[PDB]
Design an enzyme around this catalytic site. Structure first.
Site, PDB file in Angstrom:
ATOM      1  N   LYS A  63       3.481  -3.107   8.677  1.00  0.00           N
ATOM      2  CA  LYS A  63       4.689  -2.458   8.251  1.00  0.00           C
ATOM      3  C   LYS A  63       5.844  -3.326   8.603  1.00  0.00           C
ATOM      4  CE  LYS A  63       6.750   2.001   8.127  1.00  0.00           C
ATOM      5  NZ  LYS A  63       6.347   3.269   8.900  1.00  0.00           N
ATOM      6  N   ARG A 116       9.308   5.103   5.023  1.00  0.00           N
ATOM      7  CA  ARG A 116      10.728   5.577   5.027  1.00  0.00           C
ATOM      8  C   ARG A 116      11.745   4.463   5.369  1.00  0.00           C
ATOM      9  NH1 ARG A 116      12.764  11.445   5.296  1.00  0.00           N
ATOM     10  NH2 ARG A 116      13.378  10.985   7.461  1.00  0.00           N
ATOM     11  N   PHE A 117      11.483   3.823   6.519  1.00  0.00           N
ATOM     12  CA  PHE A 117      12.355   2.824   7.133  1.00  0.00           C
ATOM     13  C   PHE A 117      11.675   1.442   7.108  1.00  0.00           C
ATOM     14  CE2 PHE A 117      15.176   6.132   8.567  1.00  0.00           C
ATOM     15  CZ  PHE A 117      14.410   7.179   9.072  1.00  0.00           C
ATOM     16  N   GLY A 118      10.560   1.343   6.394  1.00  0.00           N
ATOM     17  CA  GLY A 118       9.639   0.205   6.483  1.00  0.00           C
ATOM     18  C   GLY A 118       8.717   0.249   5.285  1.00  0.00           C
ATOM     19  N   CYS A 119       7.855  -0.740   5.142  1.00  0.00           N
ATOM     20  CA  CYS A 119       7.019  -0.818   3.950  1.00  0.00           C
ATOM     21  C   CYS A 119       5.665  -1.425   4.374  1.00  0.00           C
ATOM     22  CB  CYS A 119       7.801  -1.572   2.878  1.00  0.00           C
ATOM     23  SG  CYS A 119       6.864  -2.139   1.490  1.00  0.00           S
ATOM     24  N   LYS A 161       0.792  -1.250   0.000  1.00  0.00           N
ATOM     25  CA  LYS A 161       0.000   0.000   0.000  1.00  0.00           C
ATOM     26  C   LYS A 161       0.815   1.287   0.000  1.00  0.00           C
ATOM     27  CE  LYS A 161      -4.089  -1.150  -1.370  1.00  0.00           C
ATOM     28  NZ  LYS A 161      -5.464  -1.087  -0.635  1.00  0.00           N
ATOM     29  N   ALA A 162       1.849   1.317   0.843  1.00  0.00           N
ATOM     30  CA  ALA A 162       2.787   2.447   0.944  1.00  0.00           C
ATOM     31  C   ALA A 162       4.202   1.947   1.081  1.00  0.00           C
ATOM     32  CB  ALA A 162       2.473   3.273   2.165  1.00  0.00           C
ATOM     33  N   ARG A 163       5.109   2.570   0.376  1.00  0.00           N
ATOM     34  CA  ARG A 163       6.535   2.395   0.623  1.00  0.00           C
ATOM     35  C   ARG A 163       6.922   3.559   1.584  1.00  0.00           C
ATOM     36  NH1 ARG A 163       4.700   0.501  -3.541  1.00  0.00           N
ATOM     37  NH2 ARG A 163       6.313  -1.080  -4.055  1.00  0.00           N
ATOM     38  N   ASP A 213       8.062  14.207  11.619  1.00  0.00           N
ATOM     39  CA  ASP A 213       7.936  14.082  10.148  1.00  0.00           C
ATOM     40  C   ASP A 213       6.450  14.289   9.754  1.00  0.00           C
ATOM     41  OD1 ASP A 213       8.962  13.694   7.555  1.00  0.00           O
ATOM     42  OD2 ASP A 213       8.837  11.449   7.824  1.00  0.00           O
TER      43      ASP A 213
HETATM   44  N1  LIG Z   1      -0.224   3.546   4.791  1.00  0.00           N
HETATM   45  C1  LIG Z   1      -1.427   3.114   5.137  1.00  0.00           C
HETATM   46  N2  LIG Z   1      -2.405   3.161   4.189  1.00  0.00           N
HETATM   47  C2  LIG Z   1      -3.577   2.725   4.577  1.00  0.00           C
HETATM   48  N3  LIG Z   1      -3.892   2.239   5.804  1.00  0.00           N
HETATM   49  C3  LIG Z   1      -2.963   2.230   6.739  1.00  0.00           C
HETATM   50  N4  LIG Z   1      -3.053   1.803   8.107  1.00  0.00           N
HETATM   51  C4  LIG Z   1      -1.801   1.968   8.591  1.00  0.00           C
HETATM   52  N5  LIG Z   1      -0.963   2.483   7.649  1.00  0.00           N
HETATM   53  C5  LIG Z   1      -1.705   2.618   6.483  1.00  0.00           C
END
Ligand SMILES: Nc1ncnc2[nH]cnc12
EC number: 2.7.11.30
Length: 297
Positions: free
Chosen positions: A30, A13-16, A9-11, A134
């Site tokens: 993450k 900073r220090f995790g994914c 879903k998201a890349r 941040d």
């Molecule tokens: N990056 C993210 N996008 C959607 N849901 C999340 N819940 C925790 N982190 C999230």
């Protein structure tokens, strides 16, 4: 586990961050590579602080040390917010005045509340103030109804006499959202001082909201990041230092935006938020209150 990973879903900073399945629901997982253990431990300590159960802060489920030598991954399981982050939301949607007001007030509510020292939280104990460190529209997630949720506490620092933190460095935040104090390397390890650094960044997040709102008149432009228009999406410590510190600039408040009584007052508020003088910036709680009373105009 019944933890079943699904998609990225998201890349971070220090995790994914992975969308994942747990029981009959979804959770965000993450994953930190093993060199980022100390971001995973930072982030889990923040989540574990008294009183962090709050409607506008991301909610923590579990931290798992998945194994032993060289096999170890570090998983942090929080709630999953399908609607995703504010930056991508803004990227693909133009928002109503009521939506702007709701995301602005709940986002400053969650920030004021992070910022707030709570002498005692029942069954839990003392919640100290926390600086985010941040703060940005990547790190504001959105519920089904557009309620803001602050996320990504891997850099957050508690102000708790007697419980000191680990290594805390000066320039740790996303560069584009760095207060001039921070750019110039000049930062007191004092609570008010860090809070104000967060407030300069919420200022730019406010701007981003205003910049994709239906502003009862003119056309609304395609989303850009703060300063993406002046320098780049990226260019470095040195160009920001020109534009932000030396030349004094900020993302443009458009003339025609000022002909909406709500947006006019919200921009006044933005400009106090991102003031060169750190001492002149408003607190998150004063922004929550402002936003509430502008809705009421
Ligand atoms: N990056 C993210 N996008 C959607 N849901 C999340 N819940 C925790 N982190 C999230």
């Amino acid at each position: 586990g019944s933890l079943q990973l699904l998609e990225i879903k998201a890349r971070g900073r220090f995790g994914c961050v992975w969308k994942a399945q747990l029981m009959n629901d979804f959770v965000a997982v993450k994953i930190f590579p093993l060199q980022d253990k100390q971001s995973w431990q930072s982030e889990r300590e923040i989540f574990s602080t008294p009183g962090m159960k709050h409607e506008n802060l991301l909610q923590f489920i579990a931290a798992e040390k998945r194994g032993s030598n060289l096999e170890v991954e570090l998983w942090l399981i929080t709630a999953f917010h399908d609607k995703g982050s504010l930056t991508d939301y803004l990227k693909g949607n133009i928002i109503t005045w009521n939506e702007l007001c709701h995301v602005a007030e709940t986002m400053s509510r969650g920030l004021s509340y992070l910022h707030e020292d709570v002498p005692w939280c029942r069954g839990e104990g003392h919640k100290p103030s926390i600086a985010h460190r941040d703060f940005k529209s990547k790190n504001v997630l959105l519920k089904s109804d557009l309620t803001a949720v602050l996320a990504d506490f891997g850099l957050a620092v508690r102000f708790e006499p007697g419980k000191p933190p680990g290594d805390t460095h000066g320039q740790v935040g996303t560069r584009r959202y760095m207060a001039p104090e921070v750019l110039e390397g000049a930062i007191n390890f004092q609570r008010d001082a860090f809070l104000r650094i967060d407030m300069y960044a919420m200022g730019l997040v406010l701007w981003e909201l205003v910049s994709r709102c239906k502003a009862a008149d003119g056309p609304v432009d395609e989303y850009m990041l703060p300063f993406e228009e002046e320098i780049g999406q990226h260019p470095s410590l040195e160009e920001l230092q020109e534009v932000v510190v030396h030349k004094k600039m900020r993302p443009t408040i458009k003339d025609h935006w000022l002909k909406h009584p709500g947006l006019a007052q919200l921009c006044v508020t933005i400009e106090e938020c991102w003031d060169h003088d750190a001492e002149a910036r408003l607190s998150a709680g004063c922004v929550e209150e402002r936003v509430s009373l502008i809705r009421r105009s």
